Design a protein around this nucleic acid. Sequence first.
RNA 1: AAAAA
RNA 2: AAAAA
RNA 3: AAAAA
Lengths: 587, 587, 587
Amino acid sequence: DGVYESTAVIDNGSFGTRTIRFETGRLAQQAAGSAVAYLDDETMLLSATTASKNPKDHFDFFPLTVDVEERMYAAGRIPGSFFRREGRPSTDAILTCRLIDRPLRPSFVDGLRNEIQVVVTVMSLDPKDLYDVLAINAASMSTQLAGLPFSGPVGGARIALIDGTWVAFPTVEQLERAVFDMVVAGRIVGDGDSADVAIMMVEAEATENVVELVAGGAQAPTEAVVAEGLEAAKPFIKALCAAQQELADRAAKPAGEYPVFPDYEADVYDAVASVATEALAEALTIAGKTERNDRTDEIKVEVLERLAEPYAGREKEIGAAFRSLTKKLVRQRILTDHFRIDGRGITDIRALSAEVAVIPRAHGSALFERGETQILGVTTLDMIKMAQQIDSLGPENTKRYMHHYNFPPYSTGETGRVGSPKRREIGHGALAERALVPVLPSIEEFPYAIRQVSEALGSNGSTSMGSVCASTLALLNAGVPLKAPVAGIAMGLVSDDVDVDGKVEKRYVALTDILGAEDAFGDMDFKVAGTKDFVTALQLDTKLDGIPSQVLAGALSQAKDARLTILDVMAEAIDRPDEMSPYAPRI
Amino acid sequence: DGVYESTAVIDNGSFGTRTIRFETGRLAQQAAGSAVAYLDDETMLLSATTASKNPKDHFDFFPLTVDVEERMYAAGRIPGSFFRREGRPSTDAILTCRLIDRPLRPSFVDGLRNEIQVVVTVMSLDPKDLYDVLAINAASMSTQLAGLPFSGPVGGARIALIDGTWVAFPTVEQLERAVFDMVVAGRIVGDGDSADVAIMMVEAEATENVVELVAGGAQAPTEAVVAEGLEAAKPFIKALCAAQQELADRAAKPAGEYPVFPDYEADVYDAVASVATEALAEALTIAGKTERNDRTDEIKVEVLERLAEPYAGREKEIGAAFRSLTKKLVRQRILTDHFRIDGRGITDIRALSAEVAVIPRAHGSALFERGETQILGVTTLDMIKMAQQIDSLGPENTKRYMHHYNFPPYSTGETGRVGSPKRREIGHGALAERALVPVLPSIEEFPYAIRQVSEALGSNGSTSMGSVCASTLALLNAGVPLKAPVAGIAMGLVSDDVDVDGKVEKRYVALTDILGAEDAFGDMDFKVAGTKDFVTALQLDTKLDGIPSQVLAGALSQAKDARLTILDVMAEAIDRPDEMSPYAPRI
Amino acid sequence: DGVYESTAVIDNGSFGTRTIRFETGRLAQQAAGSAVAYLDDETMLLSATTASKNPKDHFDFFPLTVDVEERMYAAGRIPGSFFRREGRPSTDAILTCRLIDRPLRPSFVDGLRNEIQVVVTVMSLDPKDLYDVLAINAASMSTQLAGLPFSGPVGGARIALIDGTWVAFPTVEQLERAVFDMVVAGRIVGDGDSADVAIMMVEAEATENVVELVAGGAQAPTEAVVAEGLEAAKPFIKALCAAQQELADRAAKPAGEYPVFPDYEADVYDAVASVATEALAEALTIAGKTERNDRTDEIKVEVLERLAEPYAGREKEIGAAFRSLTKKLVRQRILTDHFRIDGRGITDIRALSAEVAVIPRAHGSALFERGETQILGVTTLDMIKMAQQIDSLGPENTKRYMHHYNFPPYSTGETGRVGSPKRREIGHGALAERALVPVLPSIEEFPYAIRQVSEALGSNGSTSMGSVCASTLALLNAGVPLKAPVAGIAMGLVSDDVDVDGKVEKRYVALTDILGAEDAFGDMDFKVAGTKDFVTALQLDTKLDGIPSQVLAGALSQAKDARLTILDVMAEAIDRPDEMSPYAPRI
RNA sequence: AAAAA
RNA sequence: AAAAA
RNA sequence: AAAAA
Ligand SMILES: [Mg+2]
Ligand SMILES: [Mg+2]
Ligand SMILES: [Mg+2]
Ligand SMILES: [Mg+2]
Ligand SMILES: [Mg+2]
Ligand SMILES: [Mg+2]
């Protein structure tokens, strides 16, 4: 009676027809919201969102926590541990936690301080399905039901390019003819007539068989093909969002009253603006970097002195308002004068250097530095029996090529805990590993168990693409006969309204090779890695209400040009797979 | 010279004669108290109790911590880990920590805030003895010596029903003819002539051979037999308590001065009583649940307003006194009008529903919900080589049937840490696992390695018995040919003085299927699980100075009636072991 | 261009010639200081020191943290874990962290509160070199560069006694003819003409082949030989310190401004001195221990009352000044009247008792107590297949004899966390294990995998030498045919200026078997363990600017006399290897 | 970490 | 721990 | 660390 259902019928043409079914009202009725998601009546996940009672205001950020529980009775097996129990999250559970957390975290209003928490449990899994793109839907549903200030729903799909057809939610036996495979997550903006979706997250990779299939006669995953993919995942996200909205229009709890804690009030920001606008503006027109820093520090002292004490005991509000003001002014500058915070041009990569044979007695090694970023990659071939043995719900058994990404605390100069990797390091390692598997040689043409270790010896921001380039260098050095070198580049996009003399219109600009500071002044950040001919990895997080096709194509072609320059810089360090190190094993 | 001994001679008639020897003054003379306990001059434990110097008042509870250290040189073996060192506590060490903590925690006075800590180390273990029932004695002794406000000593024994004889402290080769096996822990009340013991803890289970032995001609462990057992463990607890008291009358340190921190003073409680007694009393006479909640909230606002500020800055005392007052009034109501906090009768179980075949692609599964409680059990048969390999001091080698109990944070609606299980979850898993081993089929009639996973999807209190019922359902579903289904029920008992017109006498009442709130209004809480014919598991924690035999027999027969109703509700979901799932292995 | 080098040429005569090369300016340019250290162009470590921005004043101690990262690509191998990743630090990484932390921690000025941190990463390792004595140099260099208040540099070397020649930085194939092997770390004091080094740390052990080699005709590592070793490691420390100083005179960052937080100001200490000097002095002349404690407590009450409130809200300064005053007066007493804090003489060991056959059903066991210290050792022979399998950069494969050292919290009477061992326990276990390997029987004459467990049942200070004696007792008891028993003793040395009637001269005194309190009144603390004929382990931490050869020889001969008395006390408990326990395995 | 498966 | 054984 | 390777 109190169990409500709603289905979304995914229509893949002649490749089949799937049905994702959302059900609520039966299981876990104590959480703030709960929802069970079935994929083809056989895959079954349970998501349950709970919010804390009191807002922990001592925090300075929104404390959302996603957990994915891979129960092993889903696979019909007993865990293989010594204690026959499911222990700590595997790598796939962490990657799915990140997939869920990325489009869900910016969906909550700005200033929420309660401790929201989502826990997606895999209760059944058909051995031919993937569940992460279903975990996104289950989490969005169970958060939409909870009555939180969650501007959803958030529909997520996975599309694969099989024989020129973009198949949505493909099985595992179908992901062996696909050249490209991407997870797209978005939401619907506009009602009735302008209901187009607004993609928020893209995580794309070229399958391990892209080279053989493209040699067979397929179409390689270039940038135009990736744009066709981004435009061919919209109907499915529309279907999923419509189904979630039907269910939550049946059985949603009325919106609770959660207090929001803004960083600064309106009065303080208006005051800082009115009394420092022209000062900060003329502080930005000067062609000097460090001098501009000194002038900004002086303006900081000035706002601290002249606003004391008309606003007594409100120093954090002053600082937050000043940071918002300088961010707005730098954004307007980047939009109008095309000049970035370090005098660089929009299409200028920092100073590149690639060196091979850095570490002695290593099988292969290389040091790739770009600007302040400096990565060291060390490839360690070994016996094929050393391939990592995977034990999880996922379809794969062994991992021949392992990419491990270390981010020591002194990369930025800050002390901290050295030890176990965080979730960021797992995400960066996975992103930089899925960018090299398309070009690795076969297990018959090169029978070893490669293992890559990338060290962020110096960091300014977004070191995963630098790690892709350093991994290509180290892998060519160790003697591994890659099919083609894979470069990488991490760009951003700033979009906003500007007023010419009497017109107020939106304009966009792309920034090549952004720093860590240019990530807070950007409205989209995306990382493209690929060879000379096709993209092997792509990742994109945005919050804009839709990007025109021309702007996306332009930014992606700019990314290709950056990749080609980086590739011509890398091809001077090492052109071909060098000789095996005398310490390397021989098979 | 300063080494004092005292022996307790356990006289098991014709089954032997044991001697537990307590020794102090030689080892670990830096702790607040220390004592070595020998069982038959060969089993040797060392317990050492230490108290912190300053009372950590910021805590809101008594911070006692028990640890049991299973040193492996006791078993004559080197640890088998990769690092050849004893790592984290096994399951048996955790269960023994709980066995010690359960009768020891209520023995300290109310309001102690120092950080007491007990650490029992197993220094030698004969391979034919059990040491947990000896760990209780060692811990009680070493805490009685420390000069703490510890109202001991606490004597603990293990009795087994072998051929109609209740044998105390039986070996492992003797626990194979026993039908029932129970650990009893109690203390002596009354001096000289009325020195009868007052049992505080019972943890009982029917041995894995109960069905075969009862078929042979034994007497099945019914409720009258369990009462005979509770009355046949009194002389041994008397002996152990007398020995500990001899030793601590020889070599105990004078009682130190430890401050106590009451939750509320006498003045505040007297004031709240005098000014809210009749209001809260008439607030309880109304037949409405939610309306009564609103009236109690109104009385809370009233006590907060009219007592402000005659007691300024004393809000916690107000709240604690109000909670004590409402608890006392609800207790008097339950004693007089037989009506509980939710209008239920004393012999009324909540609304039951049992469903099988819930999860798809699972070997067996079932969902059992009772009231707000809702448990999901998933049975996963596999190959016999997957039985858990145990490596510890304990006598068992492998664990064929594994019960794992998960309590997610959203069971109550609260966010929290998802991950490793606490000690409560280990205790509940063990209690619900020892309730099903008496009825599991042999390793020859059903050659698999069963594994059960019980999920507390919805929780109000005491979900372990619900997990026993859900495990019976899931196990019958997966095709496992049980010998008889095993139900469970978690009851309580409220006992107190009441005054009829001119007489003040003690009366008792039993409450069937208590909630989580009816656990703070009860003077005993006990859980009984069993088949149609005999109890397979029992657990009981009390603080009363002895219960008449009639009251205990009545409460236990009431528990049997609850079990029979639950069993007739479960027999409609699934009557017989269903067909094996096509995914299950075939041997 | 910005990459600076400096080499130190170690000249081992006819045994070879090594070259340690320090390089800076290329890798990890974001840390406060960074330096790469090469040993023979093939071993390569990277050290990077970072300091926090703000001084965490809430701490009560200097928060330095050293980490050693053993990257496995150094050894050309993939890690062997299930997850094929380097997990938690091995034992060798912890011992190297301690080797670095011991001479580095007292090098920083007194009162630093920022959170310094050193992280030494092993990027390449020739399989014939050791890297810990190189890690000390890399850490001292990268800390000298950081611009901290670090009074370095600190040069560390390893010398081995091969055929009467003290070889510096010997390989692994050369450490098989050495009888003694010691790590020496020191710094240079005096400039120009009196530039002699001032050793700060010594960690010495006799190689596993000392007995066979001494039988061959070598010179056993007596105390005079160890003194010759301490005098033969000075030129190499001079070379290393000169090289580090050349580099840091090329490319060091100017000293930053770090605030220091003294424990007490000058005014408070001067006041407490002026108003309590004679009171505390006459409080020390009395021959009563406990009475002196009462008088000191009375003087504490007096300084708290009469200095209140001329210094209001300054209680911690009062306490720190009082502790400094009493420490100074006890030091002057020990220097002048030769009387220690407990009336003992300078050459008096506490009351010794050694007992064997303590624990029943153990392969071997013994209890050795000295004063308040009381250690229990339990030897557990087993099958040779149980030897610990090591997987790390280090040269060793298996560990036949394992010494595990447990320090329970109740050793001092304080509650705490029972569980994983700290770094102190690893250091003490290693120190007490390297003291028994010289005398263990071969793998052919006694084919078992011994394992020792030492329990600090009672502790006053420095229980590692007591654990060496208890391990000798337990090992003789279990039937292991040692080549000679190994005793141990932990002495200290107090050195200071004293003024006779008109002369102010430095005098030294040695204290045999110091307590835990006599460690804060001592200017050096060293532990010597050995057999009747030679030292098998030695450890020494000092801060003095050089000790005359006569004083060191005297203190070491005093240590030998203490060892001989302890050995004659141990030889009465058990003279010869007893019979194997009937539970022990037979090979 | 962290110093005593 | 969740964001940067 | 625990109590609920
Ligand atoms: Mg970015
Ligand atoms: Mg991104
Ligand atoms: Mg209960
Ligand atoms: Mg109970
Ligand atoms: Mg010492
Ligand atoms: Mg020392």
